[PDB]
Design a protein around this ligand. Structure first.
Ligand code: HAS
Ligand code: HEM
Ligand code: CUA
Ligand SMILES: [Cu+2]
Ligand SMILES: [Xe]
Ligand SMILES: [Xe]
Ligand SMILES: [Xe]
Ligand SMILES: [Xe]
Ligand SMILES: [Xe]
Ligand SMILES: [Xe]
Ligand SMILES: [Xe]
Lengths: 550, 166, 33
């Protein structure tokens, strides 16, 4: 009655957290794999349906890297601009987003669970999984198009009510966020409609693998920024308040998301540095652009670090490290995204090496990559999500958080963080030692003797994150069990951070508000970067027979 | 406090952004260096070279594995390498040190990797495409090829061997 | 207030991390070269 949007937004989260909970179960078993330890007969006892290592890795990849992150993005980046405008979201369309998302999942899930789409979360042809995985996933990803429209609508609506007036902060973020995603989602949408779906039904019998994965990485890179920015939004707009501080700049936050809208899509060739049939020139062009999309994050590193410092100062910040201990290390809604941001430093450092073209051949498709992105998505994006419960969950439900719940929150987060770091040294090191990724290497024990040292590390992180994961489900399935609804804090607004305004907070902030212009700059840049090469590949299309080997 | 930290903050922000654009530039120049030197061979050749994968171990240089090593210049040999269902053809690959080894790799089934341990050679192998990489092995001995792409159930067991003569 | 000495050291650590990662792999690229 009071707020129907709360319900969709909560149901998005719960299902997202279920997906996480399920996928992540395979994690510790996989971490132990790269520790040369074969915990997989043990896994069979718990789940007889787990046929192969790589079945798990598909499930752990789909539910966690695709599902959970999109659901979370679909909650945060829709619910927040809404509550910030106070205007109601189209609940007819806002249940269309969730309902597509739940069924589409179930349609896709069933093949995978039945060992019918064991093709990994990248599904590179001629690897041919079951048709229902391909269909279901297509539908699940299309839910975001409902989500795009929903948020575009409130913008259009608020634009009428207050004419001439600058867009409210969070709104601005979520508008260019959903605009960028649309322009990016196309790659996989194209690949799915034109190539995957026909092929999988029987309409065609082969697929050209090069364009299949060119179109995939078109979307393959902006999708990761589609997972990140929700965390960034919270980190910009809720964290400074959570630290008991403020946001040092409004334009610099607006500039970040602006640069992402522009630069997050026309970079995707950095996944195809090894791929045959693409001019080195176009790779060096995408190599420089990937370093460019790195700028917005470096900016983020300075705006957020200052915000934190400035907060710590107010709370009795002392000397150089004096402001750090001033921050509220007891509130887990603060602690979680901050530990993730520390981990974001080596992961971001990894990401830059990865983008240096020639330097990729040193690490491409080795364990280095798992080590890199787990510091990104499974560290920052995921710990922020876990933290965005301790402040957002009481909001949607009206239910309070106790003391031993809150102390469980610090214990869960620190162990989860401390585990991803141990795992990073392990995988990175093993990667430089030439250990490939996506390999059940524990089945072949004597194969990599040189990595006996970083292997122990992955065992150590194996146990650590296991204990963390259990501890977490306990916690989550303990707020959702008790019925102690206290509907005052329900109405009590979200912890939005106060901002600093100045004399020049209008010139640039108005320039950036020209969304319609930049979206057509965004559109031009994709066309300019992906056009010549995609046109080339279509004119030499070489489809090849489907295969299944699992 | 506060009001003071918006003047100072747009100064440091600019200066930090200014620093970063040159830090990244200094990478671009160094990425360029490697592109101009000899080491740039490991970058796949641009120009498409399609093939028929089902009819590749009958018709084409990927059929007779004894013919894989073919001299194609005063000091340059080409090796026609096959990446198939959990093995590499030929096994082993004998090539002379100091020579420009031009690898030409393709697949009759799924996508595999060609990761030659101890070299910069790390190239995706695609069904219906001929990946062309170039390397000069300076040091004699045994090298080992690992497949670094998920190619099905046997993936983890998929290794190759390259022997560089003396 | 006056001079963000903390956040500077924060992006200092980041700068020093990016370099060791980047230089460290540039050195390895050249050994394998
Ligand atoms: C959320 C998920 C992800 C993020 C974020 C992410 C970031 C980057 N990545 Fe990536 N990535 C690549 C390039 C980048 C670059 C340039 C960035 C950049 O956006 C990163 C920039 C980050 C920074 C410049 C860090 C800034 C630091 C900050 C913002 C923290 C400041 C801390 C504070 C303020 C706290 C201090 C507090 C105190 C109290 C002191 C490349 C190559 O160019 C590959 C291919 C590798 C290969 O060949 O296989 C790749 C591979 C992947 C894969 C593998 C996919 C697969 O299976 O094939 C995934 C899932 C992934 C996800 C993500 N990636 N990436
Ligand atoms: C319990 C904590 C976790 C552990 C111990 C863990 C461990 C691993 C390891 C070792 C791999 C590489 C395996 C291989 O390539 O053979 C992997 C794959 C992966 N994980 Fe995790 N993981 C955890 C949590 C997560 C979470 C929460 C996410 C989602 C944000 C995630 C996303 C991914 C992705 C995208 C891959 C790549 C799948 C592929 O290559 O197809 N992981 N996991
Ligand atoms: Cu061939 Cu993995
Ligand atoms: Cu990318
Ligand atoms: Xe798909
Ligand atoms: Xe998927
Ligand atoms: Xe899905
Ligand atoms: Xe899609
Ligand atoms: Xe994708
Ligand atoms: Xe991806
Ligand atoms: Xe995807």
């Amino acid at each position: 009655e009071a707020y129907p949007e709360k319900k969709a937004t909560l149901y998005f989260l719960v299902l997202g957290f279920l997906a996480l909970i399920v996928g992540s179960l395979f994690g510790p078993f996989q971490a132990l794999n790269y520790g040369n330890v074969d915990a997989y007969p043990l896994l069979k006892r718990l789940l007889p349906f787990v046929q192969s290592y790589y079945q798990g890795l598909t499930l752990h990849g789909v539910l966690n890297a695709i599902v959970f992150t999109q659901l979370f993005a679909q909650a945060i980046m829709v619910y927040l601009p809404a509550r910030e405008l106070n205007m109601r979201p189209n609940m007819g369309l806002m249940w269309l987003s969730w309902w597509m998302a739940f069924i589409g999942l179930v349609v896709a899930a069933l093949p995978l669970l039945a060992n019918e789409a064991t093709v990994l979360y990248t599904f590179y042809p001629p690897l041919k999984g079951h048709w229902a995985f391909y269909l279901g996933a297509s539908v699940f990803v299309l839910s975001t198009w409902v989500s795009i429209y929903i948020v575009l609508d409130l913008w259009r609506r608020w634009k009428a009510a207050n004419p001439g007036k600058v867009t409210p902060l969070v709104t601005y973020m979520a508008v260019v966020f959903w605009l960028m995603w649309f322009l990016a989602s196309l790659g996989l949408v194209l690949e799915a409609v034109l190539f995957l779906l026909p092929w999988s039904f029987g309409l065609v019998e082969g697929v050209d693998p090069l364009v299949a994965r060119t179109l995939f990485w078109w979307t393959g890179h902006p999708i990761v920024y589609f997972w990140l920015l929700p965390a960034y939004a919270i980190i910009y707009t809720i964290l400074p308040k959570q630290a008991g501080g403020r946001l040092v700049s409004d334009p610099m936050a607006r500039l970040a998301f602006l640069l992402f809208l522009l630069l997050s899509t026309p970079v995707g060739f950095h996944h195809q540095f090894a791929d045959p049939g693409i001019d080195p020139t176009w790779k060096m062009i995408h190599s420089v652009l990937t370093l460019f999309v790195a700028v917005p994050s470096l900016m983020t590193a300075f705006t957020v670090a200052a915000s934190l410092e400035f907060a710590g100062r107010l709370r009795g910040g002392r000397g150089l490290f004096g402001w750090i201990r001033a921050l509220p290390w007891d509130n887990p809604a603060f602690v979680a995204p901050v530990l993730g941001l520390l981990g974001f430093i080596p992961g971001g450092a990894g990401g830059i090496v990865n983008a240096s073209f020639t330097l990729d051949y040193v690490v491409h498709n080795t364990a280095w990559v798992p080590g890199h992105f787990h510091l990104q998505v499974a560290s920052l994006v995921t710990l922020t999500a876990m933290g965005s419960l301790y402040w957002l969950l009481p909001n949607l439900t009206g239910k309070p958080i106790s003391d031993a719940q809150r102390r469980l929150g610090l214990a869960v987060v620190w162990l989860w963080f401390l585990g991803m770091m141990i795992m990073a040294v392990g995988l990175h090191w093993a990667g430089l030692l030439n250990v490939p990724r996506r390999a059940y290497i524990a089945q072949v024990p004597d194969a990599y003797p040189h990595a006996a040292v970083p292997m122990v590390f992955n065992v150590l992180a194996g146990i650590v994150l296991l204990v963390a994961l259990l501890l977490f489900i306990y916690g989550l399935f303990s707020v959702l069990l008790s019925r102690e609804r206290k509907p005052e804090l329900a109405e009590a607004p979200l912890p939005f951070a106060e901002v600093i305004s100045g004399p020049e907070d209008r010139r640039l902030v108005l320039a950036m508000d020209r969304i319609g212009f930049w979206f057509a700059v965004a559109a031009i840049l994709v066309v300019l970067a992906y056009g010549p090469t995609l046109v080339q590949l279509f004119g030499h299309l070489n489809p090849v027979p489907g295969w299944r080997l699992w | 406090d506060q009001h003071k930290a918006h003047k100072a903050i747009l100064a440091y922000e600019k200066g930090w952004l200014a620093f970063s654009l040159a830090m990244l530039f200094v990478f671009i120049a160094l990425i360029a260096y490697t592109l101009a030197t000899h080491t740039a061979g490991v970058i796949p050749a641009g120009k498409l070279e399609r093939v028929d994968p089902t009819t590749v171990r009958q018709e084409g240089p990927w059929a007779d594995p004894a013919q894989a090593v073919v001299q194609t210049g005063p000091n340059q040999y080409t090796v026609y390498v096959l990446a198939f269902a959990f093995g590499y053809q030929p096994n082993p690959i004998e090539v002379p040190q100091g020579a420009e080894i031009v690898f030409k790799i393709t697949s009759p089934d799924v996508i595999h990797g060609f990761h030659v341990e101890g070299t910069n050679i790390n190239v995706e192998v695609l069904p219906g495409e001929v990946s062309t990489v170039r390397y000069t092995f300076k040091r004699p001995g045994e090298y080992r090829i690992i497949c670094n792409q998920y190619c099905g159930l046997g993936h983890q067991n998929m290794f190759g061997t390259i022997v560089v003569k003396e | 207030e006056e001079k963000p000495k903390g956040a500077l050291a924060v992006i200092l650590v980041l700068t020093l991390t990016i370099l060791v990662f980047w230089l460290g792999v540039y050195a390895v690229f050249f050994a394998r070269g």
